[PDB]
């Protein structure tokens, strides 16, 4: 009713899958020059959605 | 800025979509798109924005 | 954000109620799983139409209903004495789900 | 597919109404299948209260989302709804009915009639 | 010598291969492994000293004078291809082509790979 929100997928990644390729871990992305060390400011996201 | 019940409108046209450029703005407190995501801004060109 | 229904219905046994609840938001969505009820006093509510327009076992095919637009519509044949019931509409939002005010059907003779 | 309840019938103001649903016939730990609870104030129409899941997802209406919470043992197929701070006009008969998407309440227990006073 | 690691980063950090043979059947296994210094076999094992998710899993015979043995190790779409051949005995001049053993079905990136040997 308010939404299910136990189905996750990927928008952040360093690059593209290979065929039947499976990535699990949730190692945050750093989208820019900085080390964000895990803290989601700018250019810094959680993989999953 | 105008003001929220009057907001301005700008459109945008033939050029260099560098989203680099406005990344210099502020610490940043809100930043958040749809549709597209924030890696392939400096990538797409659109018809009209 | 309020499913709207008629206070009462009426009309002899053997003739054709109809009873309606129309959305008032657009937060209903696709609004395609509308359920309607049979409340009996001193009893628990029955479903009698979900999903628009499906029938639940045990239930009489004089039932049935249909959708146009944002409003829904119960459709009692055949009406019996025996219909004597508020009848009431459900829906879901974007947040929770409503039911509706309630419509009293009364069968003259 | 049956639903039970029993509680209190009369609180006292401010006080803490607790109800509790048993079922029997189904499992509520099966997907698509959850437990929820409904009110019904004379003269007025049904209300959602609450939903609580087979994952133990807990929902609850927009408008008492404050003052409600909802448990559950699934070992003695029990749902336990509690109601904080009773006010004079809380009263109305309370229902325990089964919750599904296609249909959204159904198996519809008889009910309990609660008093504030 | 008994095994292989193959992986990345070799630590829980990705998804890890591990080969390992026995006297009797050889395990392996595809894990979130954090992998030992200096992983070795003790006759026990030192070669991991914890694992978080796994995915694939396989046991079956073992790949396993002195003895000479080749194998081919590819990695392809997903699948990881073992060839292998055994013959008595730097390395020996002739023919001989290695045949098929088993075909991994794992989906996992493999850059680096380490032998595993036992000690006595
Ligand atoms: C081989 O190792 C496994 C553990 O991976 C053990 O259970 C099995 O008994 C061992 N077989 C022999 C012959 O030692
Ligand atoms: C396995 O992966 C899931 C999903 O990311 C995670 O929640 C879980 O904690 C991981 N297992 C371990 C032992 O970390
Ligand atoms: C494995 O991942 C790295 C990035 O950490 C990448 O550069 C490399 O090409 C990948 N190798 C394969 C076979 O996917």
């Known amino acids: 009713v308010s939404g299910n929100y136990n189905y996750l997928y990927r928008l952040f990644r360093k690059s593209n899958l290979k065929p039947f390729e499976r990535d699990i871990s949730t190692e945050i992305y750093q989208a820019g020059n900085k080390p964000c060390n895990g803290v989601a400011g700018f250019n810094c996201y959680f993989p999953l959605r | 800025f105008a003001s929220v019940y009057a907001w301005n409108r700008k459109r945008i046209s033939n050029c260099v979509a560098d989203y680099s450029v406005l990344y210099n703005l502020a610490p940043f407190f809100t930043f958040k798109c749809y549709g597209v995501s924030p890696t392939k801004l400096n990538d797409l060109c659109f018809t009209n924005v | 954000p309020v499913l709207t229904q008629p206070a009462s219905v009426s009309g002899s046994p053997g003739q054709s109620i109809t009873i309606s609840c129309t959305a008032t938001?657009?937060?209903?969505?696709?609004?395609?799983?509308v359920s309607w009820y049979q409340h009996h006093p001193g009893k628990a509510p029955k479903l009698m139409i979900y999903?628009?327009?499906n029938r639940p076992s045990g239930v009489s095919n004089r039932f049935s209903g249909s959708k146009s637009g944002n409003t829904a519509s119960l459709t009692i044949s055949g009406l019996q004495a025996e219909d004597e019931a508020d009848y009431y509409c459900?829906?879901?939002?974007?947040?929770?789900?409503?039911f509706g005010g309630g419509t009293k059907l009364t069968v003259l003779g | 597919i049956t639903l039970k309840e029993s509680g209190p019938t009369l609180v006292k103001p401010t006080q803490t109404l607790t109800l509790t649903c048993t079922f029997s016939?189904?499992?509520?730990?099966?997907?698509?299948?959850?437990v929820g609870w409904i009110r019904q104030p004379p003269g007025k129409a049904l209300e959602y209260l609450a939903l609580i899941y087979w994952d133990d997802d807990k929902r609850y209406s927009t408008s008492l989302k404050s003052r409600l919470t909802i448990t559950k043992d699934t070992s003695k197929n029990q749902v336990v709804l509690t109601m904080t701070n009773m006010d004079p006009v809380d009263t109305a008969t309370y229902y325990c009915?089964?919750?599904?998407?296609?249909?959204?309440?159904?198996?519809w227990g008889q009910g309990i009639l609660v008093t504030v006073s | 010598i008994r095994g292989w690691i193959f992986g990345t980063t070799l630590d829980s950090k990705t998804q890890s291969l591990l080969i390992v043979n026995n006297a009797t059947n050889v395990v392996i296994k595809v894990c979130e492994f954090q992998f030992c210094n200096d992983p070795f076999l003790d006759h026990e094992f030192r070669v991991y000293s914890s694992a978080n998710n796994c995915t694939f899993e396989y046991v079956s015979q073992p790949f396993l004078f002195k003895n000479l043995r080749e194998f081919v190790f590819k990695n392809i779409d997903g699948y990881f291809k073992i060839y292998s051949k055994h013959t008595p005995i730097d390395l020996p001049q002739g023919f001989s082509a290695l045949e098929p053993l088993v075909d991994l079905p794992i989906g996992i990136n493999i850059t680096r790979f380490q032998t595993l040997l036992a000690l006595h």
């Open positions: 016939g189904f499992s509520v730990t099966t997907s698509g299948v959850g």
């Open positions: 999903e628009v327009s």
């Open positions: 009915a089964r919750h599904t998407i296609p249909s959204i309440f159904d198996y």
């Open positions: 938001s657009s937060d209903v969505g696709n609004y395609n799983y």
């Open positions: 459900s829906s879901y939002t974007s947040s929770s789900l409503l």
